[PDB]
């Protein structure tokens, strides 16, 4: 019912940024979690893709590789860690839950980064 | 004693437990997660309009009476265990006559998480009705449905998913391929609602496409008509003083298109409409007459 | 009245997972075997159909009892709460036993402990038939029977004097052949189980050579 | 919780009911509404003179044993408990051979209502045996019937009704039959006589046409042309005996 | 992947009249296409999901249709609050998103 | 409330009742008046010698120990009753492979009566062997048999004797 | 007596057996052995793509659970306590139709041995699909097989 | 048809020596469907005897 995501973070270009998505009133593991990306002014981009229960993975090519995705089963989050940042990575990041058929009913505030 | 704490676990666990009540009967609607895995695609009978499917049907639903806490994590049970809880209903629209295998046992499979979650697995055979349009055959495709649901449970109550990308939860085995006249093209699903006169049920459908093999039909009935009418045609080099030699040529040559055009329709269901084979054989009738 | 009360005695703390005499000596039991028809004898599938009347005896100091009744005379209720013997027909391709209008079965059982159990039987039996000089050929191929768990020690068969009884012959379903006698033997077979008794009963049979002549020569 | 409310309810019901006796055991009939959705005609066989049909066979009746006040929704529950209240003894009179259909589990449905409505499905195949007269054979129409009788009810402790007496058969329009054509089906209540009593019986008929394209394609043209090969023989000169000769047996022969 | 071409790019319409939003899937996606209204600087808000199936707290104006590879979505009698950008997504194989789609007045 | 009377009725009925006893066992022969109604006389195969023939069997015989006084003068009593008392176990002499019909239950039929008697009557559809002598054929006729009788009560305990007058009671 | 030894033994043996759990449920696997005794084969059919086969399929594991030293003989028991003693789920999965043969009673064997060992035994009849390359047919050579799984 | 042979002239005997051939052919066929209707029985039916008969007076 709730989704709430780490707050904006300032790096610097080749770093590594951890961000993190909270999830309240239900279990990570009933669903999938979806990691999006929206660059300024443009369309909503897949990142990748995790099953808590079983902990697979699966991302876009596009992606693969400079994106990991985790959960952890005890606090109910989930993880995306983004490295060799490069500054096409500044975007705005939405945790999102699948629901009724795969429709992404219920997504976080976003969280806002930016490599300078 | 491992076996013994196992039995108590066990035995609590099914102790005041209703398997004719669904899980969340009153306050929620469950929610069943489908797969499927075909270990084998049966040959298609033209005639009687049907194909015949062997699964693995995988089922995946959440009952909060069977949480549990012990030294394991999952519990591998014996199929008996599944009599005794509710399941699912599931059953095939188009389904002409299906078989659960149970040789040498019920081929079942259980396992309970202890967060609550049920896999619930079954070997099974299934035949299906797939009509078809038979206007282009032997030159036409088919899409052959597989339509499930539950039985007695309405929208409301209990509604099915697939449990990983639609595009991704029906699985064909690579080996498991018995059409001898079909290529399998590939697999489609989907889902949607159908409104009964009993409420209204979900609904998930798959399309199996199907292309025949024209190469049976080509030897068969093509190849002879050709021949045919060849042989038929060789008659007007013939001299015109021997009307016997050109008289038996020409019956000869009607007689086999008789026979051929007896022969071709045996094959195919007894419908209304002329097919392209038809239209070949009528065409190749018409030359050997001229 | 005191027809139950013997019933229920006999029953009570009686075990029908054990055989008569589990640990003493082997269980003997005598077969009879009235043959009602024997059916047609299809080539192409190298088989026979034949239907019969199966009856087996054997004693069980358990089912003893003291009463001015001599011999209890039940239907199949019981059949299925005393112990009976797990004999199979080995070369059977399929069998069946009879349900209509109830199980065909029958259950005496005597005052010295004597069982008397009988049951009808269709059963469609392989024999593989040499067709060298078809159509002038003539086969004895036979029906097979033994205990499917027990080995020589548990159980062990005999026929009785006289135990194979045919009926008339007349209205039979034999139309290529004509049924000339028959035969019992008894063997003792080696398989991974053990050393099982089996049972053989040999039908002669003679083609008969009146279809063929005029349908090919 | 809702639930435990619901299964104390539901072992209420269940807690002396007695299967042996009919809703209304000693008063006045009960009465049984049925409805059938027709999913296929299969397979209508001239050589067996049967037809077989899938439906959704649905039948409605009410038992005050099974009223209940505490919980306002209606009750589905899982099949299996249709083997501890009683059903009508409805079967077909003229079926040959049929079956429920038991994958994944069996094809039947069971919905209670507070008022005490039972709704009872099934899903069905039977092979019903359908006489046909085939003096017009193939431009001949058949009408085959299923009959729905309770085999031990007489008509004073069971009555039938078609509920809606017009759509209680639903989805004849949607069948497709390759070689017939449902020209019209008919609804009828009747009573029937034996000689252990008198019976509630129901009537679903259908009027099937024979399509005659595949005839004609498979046996009419044939012999219309070789009629015409027949033909050809005078025009050829009448001095030559083999050529006619041939001509004539081939035709006869063919 | 499945590439979603949704057009038009954008688009302008007073208040009180009928628009109609399409989305083009280039293979064939069943009914598993959701549509998504983004409101500046928030997170977008699932309004259609199968194919025609409003989100519990959409108002009824909204309604999609469509199936195979062609999609709409019509807002009859548009209000003031829905100046919004409209993304249409596929989720019969791993979900791609519309370029998006802009409504002013 | 009818139904704890009448379950009360039945309860009574078949306490301390043994099912493996035929009725007058100890001082009586059974007597089963039998009577059939055939609903169709299926095809006769030439083939396999046999023909199919479907019928309504019923079966009449008298029980002292289900004597009942109630309300009712005749209990039409469920399918299922039937399984709890003794039955005759009628069988087809002749019969190949006979079938009783469960659709969309079990198609019996056991009407209990104030002062004992029993009727039980079941569909069935039998196939029977017809042996022909094909001389004459096609221009031959047939006396197709259909022999039934008890399996395991010989003559001295159960005898069977139709219902009506022989020439009305099939 | 021997007979009441036997009894009170397997009336042990069956008390308070869990059907449900396999033996060493939660230990290493138990190792099954497979014995197989070709009666026929009986249809190799090309029309169907597949062919009949009879066998004494048996199988062989040891249950500690089912372990006795009082009596030094074999208990071969009426093959109605198989339904109360845990057996492997083998299935075969290329079998289009199979059964256990029924006639005189099911075709099946349970003994048991003073170490635990069972012995589990059946007569069945498998229909198995059969893939058949016809290209050099009749001068062909067909290679079909019975999968056995659990 | 066998009979109608007599009418032809003795001029054209491939003409008569067709119509016996495929006569007697027609007969041998006929035979054979006839007895593909009846269960095998050992000995001889009417329909056998006409059947036979008839094969007699074709290749008289
Ligand atoms: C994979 O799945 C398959 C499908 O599920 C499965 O096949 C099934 O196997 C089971 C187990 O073997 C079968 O169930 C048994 O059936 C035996 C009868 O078998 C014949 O008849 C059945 C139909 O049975 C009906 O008819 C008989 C007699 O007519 C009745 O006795 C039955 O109860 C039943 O009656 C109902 O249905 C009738 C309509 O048919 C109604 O008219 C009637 O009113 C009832 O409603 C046929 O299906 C069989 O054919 C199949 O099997 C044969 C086997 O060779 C095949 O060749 C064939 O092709 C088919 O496949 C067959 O013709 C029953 O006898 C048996 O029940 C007895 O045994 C059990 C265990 O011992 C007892 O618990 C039970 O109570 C019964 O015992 C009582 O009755 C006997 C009667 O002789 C007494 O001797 C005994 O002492 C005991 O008496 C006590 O109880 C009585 C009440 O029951 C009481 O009166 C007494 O007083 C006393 O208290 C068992 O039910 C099932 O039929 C199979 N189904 C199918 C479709 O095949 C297969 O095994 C699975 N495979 C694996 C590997 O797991
Ligand atoms: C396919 O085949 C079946 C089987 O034959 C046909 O079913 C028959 O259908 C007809 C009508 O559809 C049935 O006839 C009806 O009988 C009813 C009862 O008859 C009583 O009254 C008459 C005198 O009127 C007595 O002789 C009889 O013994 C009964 O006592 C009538 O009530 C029906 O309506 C009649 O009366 C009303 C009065 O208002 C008139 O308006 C009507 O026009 C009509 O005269 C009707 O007569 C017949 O019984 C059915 N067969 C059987 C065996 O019952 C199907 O019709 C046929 N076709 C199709 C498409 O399925
Ligand atoms: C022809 O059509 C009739 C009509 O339906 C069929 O009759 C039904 O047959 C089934 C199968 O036997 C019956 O179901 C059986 O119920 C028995 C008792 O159930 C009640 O009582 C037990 C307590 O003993 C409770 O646990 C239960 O909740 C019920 O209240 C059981 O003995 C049977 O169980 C058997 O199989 C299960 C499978 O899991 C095992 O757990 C058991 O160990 C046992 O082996 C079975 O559930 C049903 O009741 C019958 N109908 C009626 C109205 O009674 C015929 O079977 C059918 N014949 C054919 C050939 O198709
Ligand atoms: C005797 C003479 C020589 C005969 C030798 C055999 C040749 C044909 C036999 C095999 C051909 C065959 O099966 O090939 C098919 C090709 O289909 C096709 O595409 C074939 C279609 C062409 C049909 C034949 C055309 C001949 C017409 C020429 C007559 C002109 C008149 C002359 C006066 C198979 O097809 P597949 O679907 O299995 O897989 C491939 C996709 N097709
Ligand atoms: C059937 O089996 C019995 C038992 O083996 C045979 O009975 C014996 O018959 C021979 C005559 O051939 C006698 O000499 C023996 O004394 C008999 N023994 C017993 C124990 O009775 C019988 O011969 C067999 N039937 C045959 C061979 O047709
Ligand atoms: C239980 O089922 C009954 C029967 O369908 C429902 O009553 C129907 O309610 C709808 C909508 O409220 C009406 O349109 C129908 O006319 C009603 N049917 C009858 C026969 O009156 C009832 O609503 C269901 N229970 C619940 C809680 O919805
Ligand atoms: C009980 O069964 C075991 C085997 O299941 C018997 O011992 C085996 O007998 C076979 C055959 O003689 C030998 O090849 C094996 O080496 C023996 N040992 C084992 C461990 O298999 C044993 O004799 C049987 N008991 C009785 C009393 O017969
Ligand atoms: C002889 C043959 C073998 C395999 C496939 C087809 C054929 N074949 C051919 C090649 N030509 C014909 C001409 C007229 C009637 C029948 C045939 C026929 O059967
Ligand atoms: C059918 C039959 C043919 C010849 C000899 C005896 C019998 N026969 C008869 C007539 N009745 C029986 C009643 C119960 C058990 C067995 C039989 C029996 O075998």
Redesign the interface.
């Known amino acids: 019912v709730q989704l709430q995501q780490s707050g904006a973070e300032l790096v610097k270009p080749g770093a590594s940024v951890k961000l993190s998505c909270t999830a309240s009133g239900f279990?990570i593991?009933?669903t999938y979690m979806?990691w999006?990306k929206q660059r300024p002014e443009?369309?909503?981009?897949?990142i990748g893709?995790i099953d808590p229960?079983n902990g697979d993975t699966?991302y876009?090519?596009k992606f693969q590789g400079k994106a990991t995705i985790t959960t952890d089963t005890f606090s109910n989050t989930a993880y995306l860690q983004l490295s060799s940042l490069t500054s096409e990575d500044t975007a705005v990041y939405?945790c999102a839950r699948k629901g009724?058929?795969?429709?992404?009913?219920y997504?976080?505030?976003?969280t806002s980064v930016t490599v300078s | 004693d491992n076996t013994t704490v196992f039995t108590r676990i066990l035995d609590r666990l099914l102790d005041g437990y209703d398997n004719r009540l669904r899980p969340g009967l009153g306050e929620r609607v469950t929610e069943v997660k489908t797969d499927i895995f075909v270990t084998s695609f049966g040959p298609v009978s033209d005639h009687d309009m049907e194909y015949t499917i062997d699964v693995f049907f995988r089922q995946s639903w959440k009952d909060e009476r069977l949480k549990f806490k012990g030294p394991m994590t999952v519990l591998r049970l014996n199929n008996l265990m599944a009599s005794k809880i509710w399941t699912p209903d599931t059953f095939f629209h188009n389904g002409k006559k299906s078989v659960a295998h149970n040789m040498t046992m019920p081929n079942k499979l259980l396992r309970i998480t202890e967060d609550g979650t049920l896999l619930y697995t079954m070997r099974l055979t299934v035949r299906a009705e797939c009509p078809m349009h038979l206007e282009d055959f032997p030159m036409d495709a088919h899409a052959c449905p597989l339509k499930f649901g539950s039985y007695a449970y309405t929208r409301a109550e209990v509604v099915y998913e697939w449990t990983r990308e639609p595009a991704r939860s029906v699985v064909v085995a690579e080996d498991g391929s018995r059409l001898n006249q079909y290529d399998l093209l590939g697999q489609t699903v989907d889902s949607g609602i159908v409104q009964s006169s009993t409420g209204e049920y979900v609904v998930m459908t798959t399309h199996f496409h199907l292309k025949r093999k024209i190469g049976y039909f080509v030897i068969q009935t093509y190849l002879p008509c050709i021949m045919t009418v060849i042989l038929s045609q060789v008659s007007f080099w013939l001299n015109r003083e021997s009307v016997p030699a050109r008289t038996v040529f020409g019956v000869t040559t009607v007689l086999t298109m008789t026979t051929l055009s007896i022969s071709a329709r045996n094959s195919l269901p007894k419908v209304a409409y002329a097919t392209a084979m038809d239209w070949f054989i009528a065409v190749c009738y018409a030359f050997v007459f001229s | 009245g005191d027809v139950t009360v013997i019933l229920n005695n006999l029953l009570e703390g009686y075990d029908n997972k054990l055989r008569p005499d589990i640990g003493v000596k082997p269980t003997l039991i005598h077969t009879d075997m009235y043959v009602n028809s024997i059916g047609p004898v299809n080539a192409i599938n190298m088989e026979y159909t034949i239907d019969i009347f199966f009856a087996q005896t054997w004693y069980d100091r358990r089912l003893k009892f003291n009463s001015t009744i001599k011999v209890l005379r039940l239907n199949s209720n019981m059949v299925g709460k005393i112990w009976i013997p797990d004999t199979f027909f080995r070369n059977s391709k399929k069998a069946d036993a009879h349900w209509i209008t109830t199980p065909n079965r029958m259950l005496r059982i005597w005052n010295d402990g004597r069982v008397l159990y009988t049951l009808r039987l269709t059963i469609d039996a392989e024999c593989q038939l040499q067709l060298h000089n078809f159509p002038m050929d003539e086969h004895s191929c036979p029906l097979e029977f033994s205990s499917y768990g027990y080995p020589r020690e548990e159980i062990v068969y005999q026929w009785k004097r006289s135990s194979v009884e045919v009926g008339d012959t007349r209205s039979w379903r034999l139309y290529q052949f004509s049924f000339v006698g028959l035969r019992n033997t008894t063997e003792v077979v080696k398989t991974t189980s053990g050393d099982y008794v089996v049972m053989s009963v040999y039908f002669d049979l003679s083609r008969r050579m009146g279809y063929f002549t005029i349908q090919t020569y | 919780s809702n639930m435990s409310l619901v299964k104390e309810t539901v072992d209420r019901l269940l807690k002396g009911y007695d299967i042996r006796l009919r809703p209304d055991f000693g008063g006045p009939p009960v009465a049984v509404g049925m409805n059938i959705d027709i999913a296929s005609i299969d397979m209508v066989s001239e050589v067996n003179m049967d037809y077989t049909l899938t439906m959704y066979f649905q039948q409605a009746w009410r038992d005050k044993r099974l009223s209940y006040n505490v919980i306002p929704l209606n009750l589905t529950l899982d099949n299996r408990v249709a083997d501890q209240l009683w059903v009508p003894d409805t079967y077909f009179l003229n079926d040959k051979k049929s079956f429920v259909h038991g994958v994944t589990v069996k094809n039947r449905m069971i919905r209670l209502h507070p008022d005490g409505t039972v709704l009872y499905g099934l899903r069905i195949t039977t092979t019903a045996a359908c006489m046909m007269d085939l003096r017009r054979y193939p431009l001949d129409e058949q009408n085959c019937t299923l009959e729905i009788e309770s085999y031990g009810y007489t008509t004073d402790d069971i009555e039938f009704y078609w509920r809606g007496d017009d759509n209680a058969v639903t989805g004849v329009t949607k069948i497709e039959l390759p070689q017939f054509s449902i020209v019209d089906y008919k609804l009828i209540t009747k009573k029937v006589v034996f000689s252990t009593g008198s019976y509630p019986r129901l009537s679903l008929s259908f009027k099937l046409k024979r399509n005659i394209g595949y005839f004609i394609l498979q046996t009419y043209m044939p012999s219309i042309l070789i009629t015409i090969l027949s033909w050809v023989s005078f025009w050829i000169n009448y001095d030559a005996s083999a050529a006619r000769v041939a001509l004539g047996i081939t035709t006869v022969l063919t | 992947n499945i590439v979603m071409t949704q057009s038009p790019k954008s688009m302008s319409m007073s208040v009180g009249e009928r628009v109609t939003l399409s989305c083009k899937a280039s293979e064939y996606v069943g009914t598993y296409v959701s549509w998504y209204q983004q409101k500046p600087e928030q997170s977008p808000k699932l309004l259609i999901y199968g194919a025609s199936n409003r989100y519990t707290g959409v108002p009824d104006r909204f309604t999609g249709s469509g199936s195979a590879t062609d999609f709409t979505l019509t807002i009859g009698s548009v209000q003031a609050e829905d100046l919004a950008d409209y993304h249409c997504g596929q989720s019969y194989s791993y979900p791609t998103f519309g370029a998006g789609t802009k409504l002013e007045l």
């Open positions: 279990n593991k009933d979806y999006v443009q369309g909503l981009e897949w893709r229960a699966k876009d090519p939405y009724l058929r795969w429709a992404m009913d997504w976080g505030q976003g």
